[PDB]
């Protein structure tokens, strides 16, 4: 059956839908399967499956139902574009506090529509949230501002947070793990657990947390500077997440405000993110997106983009989220992903299809991770336009010839170099640790700074 | 960094890895990106990223780390096949109870490896869980057995549970919603909330729950048979899920054991599933997989298959999960998906790559939903081989010419027809409601039963 | 939570959103639930914000649950008539931490889609820092209205 009469209204104007403030708008790149309806027919069916409908007419359908139908308001078949308007009354709300839930947004806008037999593929590229729905989201409670304050930096434009991941990803016992933390902290600010690190049998959670707490205390006493750690508290069980978080804060004691909580938000889901967000609003919530590539990759024609994911994470209340290296590291990414960073940090920003006003909702920090080092940094910062962010370089720090501490300093210096607009090769002459990064990663040094060896050694 | 020397050992035998009981095994269909390492090099890097490694050598790496490395033990480049052995010590365990978590399995085996710059794509098709790891998973607490007991059916081979979804998907107010439930329940057993139904402003949760409870009481008094409802308790907030669940059970009272709890497990995640599983172990946990098609579709070359999803759901403790219509309904699916059902229901079963022993872990029910009706059912049951399952037909029930109750009866009769081995067209002469399904869905009747007129 | 969050609910700009027109329903105590709610509705036809008077709560003549429900109905009616959002600041003060939680939780569930229109008033000087923190930590997303009743015993310039 053809449902385009009911679920398509191409005469609706996007500007009026936005001005009305009663509709969530979603922009998809969609292709119908061969042998079914045309583009508008398939889009109308997509809208029906994503709101009030099904594949057949039902006797229960009355007047009221029609008013909450999702509507295809714009199509561009040549570019495979479909835009759908979802009345805000469709989205589920908490009984306990009347607030919105991202689970409902996902269920309607990217749920059953992903398994439709007449659709080859459909991927969400952007969404618009009006004030009436936006204000019902948690939003971030803790921001980079709170990390800057702990570090003794200015709370506005406090700058670059030098970070790392203790490698190996898994395998280090509690004390060796803690010793590596101490070493890095002599030169750097921030350490994160690698995504799967927790309570493995060879590195029990409580032993590791205690050793790291001792290492932080020692590093702070030596350097006279505050240090930060992001612990993985991810679990299937809500109560396990609470047990981990509570143990950490009590253990760190006077250093409890130096602690972020990492959550594997993509694989554990929105429920895990919210547990951390609502139980620990005063602790920086570090959304780790491990597994997101299954849908967000440009190779994928389904689900949603990294842009959409990041925008949702801000609404969920992530204090920071991994935005990728934007083509400058080892993982998949593009230079145009800078727009992701601005969507999560600014009060107003443009997506690929919709302009978004955040109405003073707190920003989410871009966390930069994956195959970065001191040499690759100036190019990254040039593309982005700022260094108010966290960057974690595991290999870039501990792979430095002179070790972790020196590795941390080369990262520090690389951003200092970028900030003062200096030539990296010339800058390196007067900055040892940064100059030693060229020798640590020669392949990168030859590609990025072709004639470095002649000038430097 | 060529990391094949450390993270690849093709001389390891799969049979010995299984016999040892110390490794989770994963089977992936993978393709390297052009311009990087070869197949084995890329697989080794994949294994490193999925366990102990990174893209560069690090000074901190000691010899203990080497013992917990994931290892590529088998490759078949021509068929894009890569098999990896993950030592069970890698997987995270609860501090509170020492039990396993699926979140850790997912993070290692299908996490950061999905964003690697040197991999075009990689999708998991099967996994093997040894006894030492398997026994640490929750597993299902409630099964179809418990639903059969409530219905007054035999607890062994209690048969087909006739179900539906109250359509429209959203839009019905509490009393009209409840009236439709009552109507269906005159002929059927089971009703589920549609995946997004909850506490919308036009149909508040508490008003709807109360109206449905009244409708169940009325339908049970009229028919003299027990009726079942599966309520959506999904939420981002753990405490919201608890509030919904607790309210429902207190409201239904003496009918509280007639209630299943539906969780949008794919979009809300494992954390939401576990909340329901651990807080309400005595209530049938209905895993709704909405959104799964983003990765599970054969069109997708990434993430994991529907088979893998279903197998994980059993470990998580789903009492039932949607397995799709196996090519017989409106959604994407294939006849070979019958193997999904057997993996979730049997104590021993074969996946596409690994044989799995469940060690007496409870079964997860196959829930059949999406564009089904009485006409499409006999073909579905023939392919599967049994009718010990729940089937929900929204359009197939309320789209019936005579209405919901008659729609329910046509579904009942369609399974009776299959069970007896009768010809659907001839069976329909003696069974009105089933015969009226041909008239209700003529397009389907013409394809499946050409000369029905 | 700040005034920014109240401005957002009112549909005002989040920067310099301006003046929030408020009142206290007088008499301070004595109004039964429905007369109390009727007075709220009346004021809300022209104003934004209503606060409980400091001692208003669960008096025997105006039970807490009956009053909260009547006010919720009055807010809904006033918003439907005016087409503008309305705000209420409820007194949740108690000696018992769990009483404060019971009151707060009841209010938010009752107001439902209007739960972000609710502030929580605490008699912070007389009940003390412990009461303030209960509200602050249990309900961080609800505007915390510190009522200072009794402060004059020390803060007055007459006091040395
Ligand atoms: Mg990592
Ligand atoms: Mg459905």
UniProtKB/Swiss-Prot annotation, chain C:
TM region(s), chain numbering: none
Lineage: Bacteria, Pseudomonadati, Pseudomonadota, Alphaproteobacteria, Hyphomicrobiales
Record key words, sorted: Calvin cycle, Carbon dioxide fixation, Lyase, Magnesium, Metal-binding, Monooxygenase, Oxidoreductase, Photosynthesis
GO biological process, one term: reductive pentose-phosphate cycle
This protein's name: Ribulose bisphosphate carboxylase
Extra remark beyond the main annotation: The basic functional RuBisCO is composed of a large chain homodimer in a 'head-to-tail' conformation. In contrast to form I RuBisCO, the form II RuBisCO are composed solely of large subunits.
Subunit field text: Homodimer.
Function field: RuBisCO catalyzes two reactions: the carboxylation of D-ribulose 1,5-bisphosphate, the primary event in carbon dioxide fixation, as well as the oxidative fragmentation of the pentose substrate. Both reactions occur simultaneously and in competition at the same active site.
In-chain residues carrying the UniProt-annotated modification N6-carboxylysine: 51
Active site, per annotation: 26, 147
Binding residues for substrate: 28, 148
Binding site for Mg(2+): 51, 53-54
UniProt KW Metal-binding keyword: yes
Molecular function GO labels: magnesium ion binding; monooxygenase activity; ribulose-bisphosphate carboxylase activity
Family: Belongs to the RuBisCO large chain family. Type II subfamily.
């Amino acid at each position: 059956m053809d449902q385009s009469n009911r679920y398509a209204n191409l005469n609706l104007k996007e500007s009026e839908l936005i001005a009305g403030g009663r509709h969530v708008l979603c922009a998809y790149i969609m292709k119908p399967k061969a042998g079914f309806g045309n583009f508008i027919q398939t889009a109308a069916h997509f809208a029906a499956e994503s709101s009030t409908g099904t594949n057949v007419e039902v006797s229960t359908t009355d007047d009221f139902t029609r008013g909450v139908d999702a509507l295809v308001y714009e199509v561009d078949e040549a570019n495979s574009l479909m835009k759908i308007a979802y009345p805000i009354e469709l989205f589920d709300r908490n009984v306990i506090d009347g607030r919105a839930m991202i689970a409902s947004f996902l269920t309607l806008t990217i749920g059953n529509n992903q398994g439709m037999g007449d659709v080859e593929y459909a991927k969400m590229y952007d969404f618009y949230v009006p004030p009436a729905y936006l204000k019902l989201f948690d939003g971030p409670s803790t921001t980079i501002k709170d990390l800057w304050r702990v570090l003794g930096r200015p709370v506005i434009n406090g700058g670059f947070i030098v970070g790392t991941i203790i490698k190996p990803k898994l395998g280090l016992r509690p004390q060796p793990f803690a010793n590596a933390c101490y070493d890095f902290w002599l030169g750097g600010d921030f350490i994160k657990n690698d995504e799967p690190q927790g309570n493995q049998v060879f590195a029990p959670f409580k032993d590791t947390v205690r050793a790291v707490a001792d290492a932080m205390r020692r590093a702070q006493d030596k350097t006279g500077e505050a240090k930060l750690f992001s612990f993985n508290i991810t679990a299937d069980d809500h109560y396990e997440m609470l047990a981990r978080g509570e143990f950490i804060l009590e253990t760190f004691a006077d250093n409890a405000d130096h602690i972020a909580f990492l959550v594997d938000g993509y694989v554990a889901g929105p429920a895990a993110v919210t547990t951390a967000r609502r139980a620990f609003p005063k602790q920086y919530l570090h959304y780790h997106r491990a597994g997101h590539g299954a849908v967000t990759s440009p190779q994928s024609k389904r689900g949603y983009t990294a842009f959409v994911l990041s925008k949702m994470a801000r609404l969920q209340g992530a204090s920071g989220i991994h935005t990728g290296t934007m083509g400058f590291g080892k993982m998949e990414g593009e230079a145009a992903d800078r727009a992701i960073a601005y969507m999560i940090t600014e009060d107003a920003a443009d997506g690929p299809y919709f302009h978004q006003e955040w109405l003073g909702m707190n920003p989410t920090t871009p966390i930069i991770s994956g195959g970065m080092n001191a040499l690759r940094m100036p190019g990254f910062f040039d593309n982005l336009g700022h260094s108010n962010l966290i960057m974690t370089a595991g290999g870039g720090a501990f792979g430095h010839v002179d070790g972790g501490a020196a590795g941390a300093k080369s990262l520090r210096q690389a951003e200092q170099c970028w900030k003062q607009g200096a030539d990296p090769v010339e800058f390196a002459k007067d900055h040892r640790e940064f100059a030693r990064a060229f020798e640590s990663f020669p392949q990168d040094a030859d590609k990025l700074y072709p004639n470095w060896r002649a000038k430097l050694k």
